[PDB]
């Protein structure tokens, strides 16, 4: 029903997306002449998988599970964008704005912590062609940008940075610099991720949809210091569509 902040505060529910009944299996008609918007998009991740970096034998890379260590801080919400109807009938969502990134740290077996910028920044996701309505078989697929996990002012523990900081290892005044260049020279990555959204619940009355998502993106590379990992994220999403 109506929940107040005071009802929710401290419970962990602020990190949860809204859900729809099991009887919300309707269809939302898409009026091609009309123009639409996602008034709220919520992505709540439930599992983080990291691809194993195998050995020199070119055997097999598997996605292994991980342990979240940064608590109920992972969900993207209040995301908005135009929902466009295209010529071929497909729908395209173009994100404008929202809380569209959370830094997350998971931990692998052995104790390696893997930070990542879980994000759908600049998301553009499209349906298959000729979609006269959104149904519990509707799929969006899209891609987003993954900016660097730290941004340009971030100083490392010896004071080095991109847009600020020392440009060298000042504690080793007369060391050969060439061995340290990768650490001394901060670099800002920008990469792409891919995401599937599978609508499995529709309240054709309200324009609410809900389902699951899977995304693949890269993890933090620490401003070029080491190579990132591949991450696969899975979870649930909720969105409400309003005529624009």
């Amino acid at each position: 029903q109506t929940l107040t902040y005071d009802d929710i505060v401290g419970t962990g529910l602020a990190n949860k997306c809204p859900t729809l009944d099991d009887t919300a299996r309707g269809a939302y008609p898409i009026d091609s002449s009309q123009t639409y918007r996602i008034a709220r998009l919520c992505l709540q991740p439930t599992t983080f998988l990291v691809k194993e970096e195998p050995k020199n034998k070119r055997q097999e890379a598997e996605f292994v599970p991980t342990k979240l260590v940064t608590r109920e801080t992972t969900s993207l919400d209040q995301i908005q964008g135009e929902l466009k109807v295209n010529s071929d009938g497909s729908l395209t969502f173009v994100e404008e704005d929202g809380i569209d990134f959370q830094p997350v740290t998971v931990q692998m077996a052995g104790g390696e912590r893997i930070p990542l910028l879980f994000t759908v920044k600049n998301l553009v996701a499209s349906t298959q062609p000729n979609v006269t309505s959104i149904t519990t078989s509707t799929d969006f697929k899209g891609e987003f940008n993954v900016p660097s996990y730290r941004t340009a002012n971030f100083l490392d523990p010896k004071g080095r940075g991109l847009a600020s900081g020392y440009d060298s290892a000042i504690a080793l005044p007369q060391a050969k610099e060439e061995e340290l260049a990768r650490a001394n020279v901060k670099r800002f990555s920008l990469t792409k991720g891919q995401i599937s959204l599978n609508v499995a619940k529709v309240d054709g009355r309200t324009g609410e949809i809900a389902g699951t998502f899977e995304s693949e993106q890269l993890s933090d590379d620490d401003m070029g210091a080491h190579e990132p990992h591949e991450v696969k994220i899975q979870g649930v999403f909720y969105a409400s569509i309003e005529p624009a």
């Binding site: 660097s148 002012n153 991109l162 847009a163 020279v185 901060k186 800002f188």
Partner: protein, 97 residues
Amino acid sequence: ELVNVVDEKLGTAYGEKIDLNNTNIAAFIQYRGLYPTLAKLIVKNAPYESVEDVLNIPGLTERQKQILRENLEHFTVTEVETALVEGGDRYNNGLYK
């Protein structure tokens, strides 16, 4: 093969002029009439392919187009540098006094 792209930018026109595609919004205080109103329009409206595209911004007044012309000599454009425009850094770049 490894370069600090912010240092490389200081060697371009970004280092001498207000770079409509990269410079932080506080730099528009340097010249009369630009801040806050026009600085906001400039930054908001994409990057620019040439300095003079700035006069084509929808909605300028005649007084505004005239201020922009007076200050074209203080503007440049260079390629957009991710590290300078990400994180909303064009609006707040961590620098105060």
